[PDB]
Design a binder for this molecule. Structure first.
Ligand SMILES: Nc1ncnc2c1ncn2[C@@H]1O[C@H](COP(=O)(O)OP(=O)(O)O[C@H]2O[C@H](CO)[C@@H](O)[C@H](O)[C@H]2O)[C@@H](O)[C@H]1O
Ligand SMILES: Nc1ncnc2c1ncn2[C@@H]1O[C@H](COP(=O)(O)OP(=O)(O)O[C@H]2O[C@H](CO)[C@@H](O)[C@H](O)[C@H]2O)[C@@H](O)[C@H]1O
Ligand SMILES: Nc1ncnc2c1ncn2[C@@H]1O[C@H](COP(=O)(O)OP(=O)(O)O[C@H]2O[C@H](CO)[C@@H](O)[C@H](O)[C@H]2O)[C@@H](O)[C@H]1O
Ligand SMILES: Nc1ncnc2c1ncn2[C@@H]1O[C@H](COP(=O)(O)OP(=O)(O)O[C@H]2O[C@H](CO)[C@@H](O)[C@H](O)[C@H]2O)[C@@H](O)[C@H]1O
Ligand SMILES: Nc1ncnc2c1ncn2[C@@H]1O[C@H](COP(=O)(O)OP(=O)(O)O[C@H]2O[C@H](CO)[C@@H](O)[C@H](O)[C@H]2O)[C@@H](O)[C@H]1O
Ligand SMILES: Nc1ncnc2c1ncn2[C@@H]1O[C@H](COP(=O)(O)OP(=O)(O)O[C@H]2O[C@H](CO)[C@@H](O)[C@H](O)[C@H]2O)[C@@H](O)[C@H]1O
Ligand SMILES: Nc1ncnc2c1ncn2[C@@H]1O[C@H](COP(=O)(O)OP(=O)(O)O[C@H]2O[C@H](CO)[C@@H](O)[C@H](O)[C@H]2O)[C@@H](O)[C@H]1O
Ligand SMILES: Nc1ncnc2c1ncn2[C@@H]1O[C@H](COP(=O)(O)OP(=O)(O)O[C@H]2O[C@H](CO)[C@@H](O)[C@H](O)[C@H]2O)[C@@H](O)[C@H]1O
Ligand SMILES: Nc1ncnc2c1ncn2[C@@H]1O[C@H](COP(=O)(O)OP(=O)(O)O[C@H]2O[C@H](CO)[C@@H](O)[C@H](O)[C@H]2O)[C@@H](O)[C@H]1O
Ligand SMILES: [K+]
Ligand SMILES: [K+]
Ligand SMILES: [K+]
Ligand SMILES: [Mg+2]
Ligand SMILES: [Mg+2]
Ligand SMILES: [Mg+2]
Lengths: 7, 489, 489, 489, 7, 7, 7
């Protein structure tokens, strides 16, 4: 789940 | 909440577009939390012309480039300013909109985002609104409703001809009454309540609420270590008859399992002996009756017994004949203790007696009993929280109107209970709850607090049943109460 | 099924040899699934002259070169065309056949494949057929029967003088009645049902079936969340007497544990008080009787009580004297509600009353009761599904004929129940089942559906008992019902 | 990215306030993901007068009512329009701002949100900006920087006199160069990159990027099952000298551990024998030299050896004297194969030779070597990606400028590598990487692709070392490469 | 997997 | 962690 | 168990 943050 | 939006825009100065952006992104985050990674799904976003649709346009636009496919079907005739702005963004961002729905379209999509109507629903849904909703409902796809499933009246939970059945509903600020009452509670599926930037003071000012675990935990009375049974109150339960010998036992144990110090039953002889054969902890006083029912000849003994207690519960299993009516009404008129009035004591109640009582009362009708009590139909009263509030205010009482969602009100504050399951849909359940409420009052909670804690814990105990809920019985429910209490902290 | 074979060959055009090949390989695969790797075993294949034997020749030939040793003993006098063809293949493939059996032969083999007789068994087995079967039965070897253990009549489950006792039986298309009814069910051991290529439409057209978990799961009624006890029906149970005070309690809880909303007992005073001392959930109405038994003087009170319910169960513990007979028959004649008629209500039943009733009925006799009811011996009626079907059809009822395998029929559709164990062979078991059936009818299942679901769940609950089955009692059975329901989904 | 903001506002029409709201909420969500529940913390939000500060005002306002305490210290002189709007909201919502900082203030707070300067930093930080940053840095509190830690030039990663050291940095859209290059990479702490609503097309159009696991996975060449060593290429490594006998061995195994089919070393005799004593897999060709170094007398043998390979690596351990210079330059001038030029081949390189070569080249200098190569100081070249790009473009090569963050560029596309640790800060590390790059070129990746995959995997292998990184040596690094490759898929 | 055997 | 969603 | 398939 990566809609908001690229980590 | 419509006041809450207006105030946040007009007095606090939050741009309406900012609220709408926050709403749409909440939906995206909620879907991700529920579906996991969104990048493999194709989304069909159904947008009305109102602000619900505008929220949908924000969802659509924020999925662009990030998921497999997004299509919007715009089903409205005109667009509010924020819906128009967000439609404009969606299209500027390369988004595809169509205005004609084709039955087969559900084919090429995995998730339907239902942004057709929210709190602006007025009247029955018909036409292509109806057809599209019925197509979505037959489709077997994952359905995510924006704010409220389209077709639910968000003030009542009623279905306006037809409504979307959602897997996931994302609502803004606070739950709406239509997610809480049925059938709406059913069509909501899993509800997430998103913070979209309303001041917390405004969110807190809503006067109807859902009873939560945290609220019940903070209301549970204290158990000081240097205590004795008198610390924890005394209850008298006036109940039973030659026809209905089990009711007293279930009410009495209801009081004992919530921590009450002393419980006394008054029950016609020999039916009183049933209680102590099952639970010898109980005190079950034999009342000598003419024909197996309480009558005016027992009035004096019952008031005498009432003197040494903190609260009196009355009604379960009493029977409903004229001698019971005379007794119940003369008793309640003279009793100067809090009363919990249930079942047959409700069926014979003269509501003038409630107005004249100085001491408090809680009434615990199911809708059948509430209907007879106010001389309306079951359908007029079921889930009618405004009628409940009027009744509580007019009669100076707390009203606990039982159903899958239970309403608890004193006329000023109203609470909704959503714990429980269908194993409570069986004789005996109500009798337990009556005892629990009396118990908590005896322990020092107000009638409203006692009722709030009791309806929550009663339903939560039902959910702790290990096997299939339909096999739950009242006796098992009783055994589960102390586990519900432990899980509550 | 013999029609099913003929049709598949003659109308669909599947070569009879292809069916026979598929049959034999199914047996090989079934043995491997049961024994693990077959390559270390020596096989003795006993083949008759019919198609069962022909199946055996396919088994034998397919084991050649792959297992330690294979020998066929051909015990017939002549061979049908497909048996002849497959005998020819076995021998072309290097297979060894002998036609003389020697007691010591069992010595050098590990597995016996019993392909002597299948559905073509006619009359008693004698001679060297008998001796070989008795030798196989004394041998302690692993026994695998092709289609049906030789000696079982596949239409009745009876033993025709003597029969093979199998560890594993592989049958084709559908289970046969002789695997389902005893003693045949016993001699079958573990039954595998192989698909050998019949069209699925033909396999589905068989009108007698085994009640399965999937069938019961799809019949269980729904529990809509917005429900109340009235949703789930009301039952009246008319039961008990001064002699038999426990029966009502077990029937009443039977109804409550399957999800019924309200249960009322009518029981002679003071025996009615027994029920609520044990389960206060129950309503146990005192019936004033002259000498401790229902009589015509209670007719009017019982019909009045019947008005406010959906179904009436009658019979457990009533006693059987002439006043009970007058009551039961006049009651059932006048009652216009579904009835579940058990025990002593069966023993006094005038079957003319059943024909004249407009409302439905389920009867739940054990074979002793069925025998008295139709004036035959226990041995004439036990497992006599055709007699049961005739009776149900003639009297417009559902008949539940109880035994280790229970038969449930309305005269058109017949179902066999195979759940349960010997812990149900104890007073009280039947009383529970009566309540379960009434319960499911009250919840809205048809009399046949209610009976089908109830006999299955009743037996499955018995199997969930944790300790030795012989210690099971009805009260424990009741506690297991909600676990059976949960395991069913 | 400043273009990206402008375009999103001015061409796509996203209100600047909406971007700013999305930015601030990203920070809130990022803190929660890092700190867990925020409700027990007290927050000190330090806001400048620019848009960074405006982002801070959104953070502050969104924490109101939800955390233990929030205070804003506004340190600017004037406010941009969006900072002014969000300041206005914070205050309308009941937020507290002060404009005077007191050393002791850090006392009563748990988290500092640094929203002083973002990408608008111009020139050295002094005065109360400096003092507050130095106080925050001494404080031991949890520091969360908005966009870039204040004081880092977001284009270079340099510290402008002083800068905030953050535990967590939340940046918007894409990582900035100043989070990637040191010292800025160090002061960023844990970096989260938030999506705040820029069109994905604009985010994708940035021409400098971080090398990621996904990029390297998709570049790894395929291993078709029907293959042989020739499938996977041949490398010649020209390396070593009587002084530096180990370098060839580390380069050669570097090629073999990344999957290269055949590796040949050319190394002066007898130093060539060192390689095969350690790894007999290698082919180590003895080159007869006058004094232990390659010279023009070896030119012809080396070109001959080059004919049968796909790529030539040259330079590690060659030594740097005039005969080596003549050899290296005449060789590279004549070699018509891709070259990987490292170490001493860089130190003697005549860059005119690179311009005239038709075949490609990768150069792999550390900053000391890059400094000598272009006649600048180490401080002028270190992390100078624009200088690297100019050099690559001017000389038609790929330049791999090694350091804790490695820069890989062909003059058009530039990539930054952030894998690795200080165990690579030890003789031998570079020699390994040279072999890896040659290897990947031999397997068919372009010089830029080969370099991108190699710098990533080289650093990732270092991180897989089991013990303390400072004990890592090149020989252990080699053994870790195939594990890095496996973890990459 | 139930193509061959119902158990 | 409950800033965005009450569940 | 290997009567049908060699794998
Ligand atoms: N029953 C109905 N049938 C068709 N259209 C309807 C409807 N009820 C409401 N609408 C339309 O839907 C819109 C209202 O939708 P929202 O629930 O989005 O209201 P808003 O949030 O804008 O307040 C209006 O355009 C209204 O005209
Ligand atoms: N949750 C609910 N919803 C709708 N109706 C309900 C209800 N609970 C009870 N009722 C109504 O009340 C009736 C059953 O209650 P009664 O008072 O008639 O019988 P009781 O068994 O309580 O004595 C039903 O006819 C039904 O209409
Ligand atoms: N489907 C359901 N879900 C949740 N709660 C339910 C329920 N059905 C019944 N209940 C609860 O169980 C109790 C039933 O009490 P009543 O007085 O309605 O009937 P009873 O027959 O026990 O007398 C109430 O608290 C009611 O809220
Ligand atoms: N009771 C009995 N004793 C001896 N032989 C019998 C018998 N009953 C049947 N058989 C013989 O067994 C054969 C029938 O066997 P199957 O059950 O294989 O019948 P099919 O499948 O061929 O129909 C016939 O040859 C019949 O003659
Ligand atoms: N499964 C079964 N098989 C054979 N006989 C059965 C049977 N169940 C009951 N019976 C018969 O019924 C008799 C026992 O039942 P009764 O009706 O005589 O006594 P009950 O205890 O039911 O009163 C036995 O004699 C036996 O023959
Ligand atoms: N050995 C066995 N296996 C499976 N079920 C059995 C059984 N013995 C008895 N049962 C079942 O248990 C119940 C017995 O009921 P009855 O009415 O026969 O006797 P009871 O004495 O309980 O009256 C029936 O459902 C019957 O099918
Ligand atoms: N070195 C410095 N010392 C003091 N103030 C500075 C500074 N560099 C920039 N500023 C001020 O900080 C603001 C710029 O901050 P941002 O990084 O928030 O720029 P923006 O995002 O508004 O573009 C401007 O008000 C500028 O005047
Ligand atoms: N990452 C880095 N940063 C700064 N300087 C570096 C560097 N790597 C190497 N250097 C510089 O290069 C010098 C060391 O390299 P040399 O070429 O002088 O010796 P080598 O051991 O490579 O032969 C140091 O003086 C240092 O300035
Ligand atoms: N601190 C660090 N972090 C990450 N990578 C590092 C590092 N120090 C060195 N490296 C890497 O290790 C290799 C060092 O190669 P050089 O050619 O600089 O020195 P060597 O002495 O091995 O010859 C380079 O890839 C460099 O990027
Ligand atoms: K909606
Ligand atoms: K057989
Ligand atoms: K900052
Ligand atoms: Mg009730
Ligand atoms: Mg019986
Ligand atoms: Mg080096």
């Amino acid at each position: 789940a990566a809609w908001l943050f690229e980590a | 909440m419509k006041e809450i939006d207006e105030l946040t825009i007009k007095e606090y100065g939050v741009d309406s577009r900012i609220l709408m952006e926050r709403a749409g992104i909440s939906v995206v985050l909620a879907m991700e939390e529920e579906l996991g990674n969104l990048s493999d799904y194709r989304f069909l976003v159904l947008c009305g012309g109102g602000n619900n649709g505008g929220d949908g346009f924000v969802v659509a636009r924020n999925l662009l480039g990030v998921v497999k496919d997004v299509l919007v079907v715009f089903l409205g005739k005109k667009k509010t300013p924020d819906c128009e702005y967000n439609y404009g963004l969606y299209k500027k961002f390369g988004g595809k909109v169509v205005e004609q729905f084709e039955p087969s379209i559900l084919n090429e999509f995995d998730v339907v985002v239902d942004a057709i109507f929210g709190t602006g629903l007025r009247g029955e849904i018909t036409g292509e609104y109806a057809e599209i909703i019925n197509l979505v409902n037959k489709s077997g796809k994952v359905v995510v409703s924006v704010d409220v499933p389209s077709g639910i009246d968000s003030n009542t939970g009623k279905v306006l001809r037809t409504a979307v059945k959602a897997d996931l509903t994302v609502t803004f600020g606070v739950p709406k009454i239509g997610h809480i009452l049925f059938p709406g509670r059913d069509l909501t599926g899993k509800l997430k309540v998103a913070n979209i930037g309303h001041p917390v003071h405004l969110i807190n000012s809503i006067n109807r609420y859902v009873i939560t675990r945290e609220m019940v935990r903070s209301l549970l009375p204290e158990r000081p270590r240097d205590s004795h049974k008198g610390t924890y109150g005394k209850v008298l339960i006036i109940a039973g008859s030659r026809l209905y010998s089990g009711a007293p036992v279930l009410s009495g144990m209801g009081s004992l399992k919530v921590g009450t110090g002393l419980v006394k039953l008054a029950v016609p002889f020999p039916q009183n002996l049933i209680a102590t054969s099952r639970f010898p902890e109980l005190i079950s006083v034999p009342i000598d009756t003419e024909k197996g029912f309480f009558s005016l000849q027992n009035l004096q003994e019952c008031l005498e017994l009432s003197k040494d207690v903190d609260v009196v519960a009355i009604g379960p299993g009493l029977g409903n004949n004229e001698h019971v009516r005379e007794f119940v009404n003369e008793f309640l008129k003279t009793l100067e203790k809090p009363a919990v009035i249930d079942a047959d004591a409700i069926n014979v109640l003269d509501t003038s007696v409630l107005k004249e009582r100085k001491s408090p009362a809680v009434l615990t009708p199911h809708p059948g009993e509430m209907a007879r009590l106010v001389k309306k139909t079951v359908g007029d009263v079921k889930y009618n929280y405004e009628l409940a509030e009027e009744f509580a205010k007019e009669n100076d009482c707390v009203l606990v109107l039982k159903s899958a969602t239970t309403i608890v009100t004193d006329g000023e504050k109203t609470l909704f209970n959503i714990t429980g399951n269908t194993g409570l849909s069986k004789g005996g359940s109500g009798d337990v709850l009556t005892g629990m409420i009396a118990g908590f009052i005896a322990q020092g909670l107000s009638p409203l607090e006692a009722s709030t804690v009791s309806v929550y814990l009663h339903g939560f105990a039902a959910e702790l049943f290990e096997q299939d809920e339909r096999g739950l019985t009242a006796s098992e429910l009783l055994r589960l109460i102390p586990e519900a209490i432990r899980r509550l902290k």
